[PDB]
Amino acid sequence: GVLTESNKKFLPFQQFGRDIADTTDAVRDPQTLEILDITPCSFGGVSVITPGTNTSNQVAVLYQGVNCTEVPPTWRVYSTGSNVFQTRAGCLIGAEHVNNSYECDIPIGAGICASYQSIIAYTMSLGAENSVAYSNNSIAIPTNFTISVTTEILPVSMTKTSVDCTMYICGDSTECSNLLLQYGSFCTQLNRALTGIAVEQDKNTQEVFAQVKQIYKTPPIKDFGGFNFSQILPDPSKPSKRSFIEDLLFNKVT
């Protein structure tokens, strides 16, 4: 640790001190008989803020909870005089601080976040500011309209996987199986839980989709007042009878 001149006073009979869970926070030297306090030297995690290997190979390194004053796995270019920015989430090296502020891509913390223009760091922007013209005898009324179509994606189920407890641990060994038998019924509980998850997976799909009493079929002559549902409706040409949008969705996810 790092020693410092302690301020707290000891009664003439103690030798050291602690606060919680045997964490020795103080000690007196056996020769000068001076009360010193002990605190650990700084440590923390390291993060990389690359914008992707594709585009550029430039990176920014963040040391979390470390003061900029003291810093020096060598990282030669990052401890010799490069531009260093100190934030509330740590110290940032390799990203210049811009006085502007706007919507960003990569969060850092404490309202500071970074993006690739070089790499810059700046305060997050919540949004644009407008002052609505409020008055006690004024109203705004629409004179037109627009129709918007938006997409919402919701996962309903995952793959049904089953793991054999006995064969995973032992794998065709009679001695291993005999030794494992002494452990009780852990394997039975694990298999039961996995099968329960597997059944819940089918129950989820049944709850989500099976909500029609009958299989309704669209008429051949499609005259819906001008509204065109060709892409949404199933395509008989495709063997799977999926629509255009469904085909695109299935192609994207693999």
Binding site: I20, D22, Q64, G109, G111, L126, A133, S135, I139
Partner: protein, 193 residues
């Protein structure tokens, strides 16, 4: 601490206060129109008349009784201040999360002071007092105990985070429906109409 770091939140409290201020200014000056699209200004009396129409009372009643309604609203919001300032334990739900997290972290710290069947709980003491061939026997017990304690902590944190996510989803739905509009769901937005 020993490897225990706390990560600051991405949104500082000033930004959250700014968001609430934007919400509140928008709902005062526009009603529910700013939720759907662009914010359309409206006198606050007419918005109240619209909301009375929404709950089933004709807008006549608001205009005939505007001063009384304003006084009642002001008195109720003043009593809110009085109850918050004077009475305590109103925020017990928020305090429970902090207490639970602090207690879990404290027990995780205190599990570092247990022998777990070794000769000591101080690893440096075991190293200094004992030769390498015999030190591994104690170190393995220490490893087993500390791994088990850490795994228990992580599992409990995941289970708690699930509940916090459920509460956050409910809060987001209430912000969307109670604040950006007028809801007809019974007891979803307070008690009454």
């Amino acid at each position: 601490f020993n490897g225990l770091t706390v990560l600051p939140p991405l949104l500082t409290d000033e930004m959250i206060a700014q968001y609430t201020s934007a919400l509140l200014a928008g709902t005062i000056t526009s009603g529910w129109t700013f939720g759907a699209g662009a914010a359309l200004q409206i006198p606050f009396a007419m918005q109240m008349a619209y909301r009375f129409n929404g709950i089933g009372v004709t807008q006549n009643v608001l205009y005939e009784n505007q001063k009384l309604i304003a006084n009642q609203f002001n008195s109720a919001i003043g009593k809110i201040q009085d109850s918050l300032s004077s009475t305590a334990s109103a925020l017990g739900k928020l305090q429970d999360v902090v207490n639970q997290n602090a207690q879990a972290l404290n027990t995780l710290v205190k599990q570092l002071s247990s022998n777990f069947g070794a000769i000591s709980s101080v690893l440096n003491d075991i190293l200094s007092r004992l030769d390498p061939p015999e030190a591994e026997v104690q170190i393995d017990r220490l490893i087993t105990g500390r791994l088990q304690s850490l795994q228990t902590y992580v599992t409990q944190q995941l289970i708690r985070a699930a509940e916090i996510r459920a509460s956050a989803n409910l809060a987001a739905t209430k912000m969307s429906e109670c604040v950006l509009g007028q809801s007809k769901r019974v007891d979803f937005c307070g008690k009454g109409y």
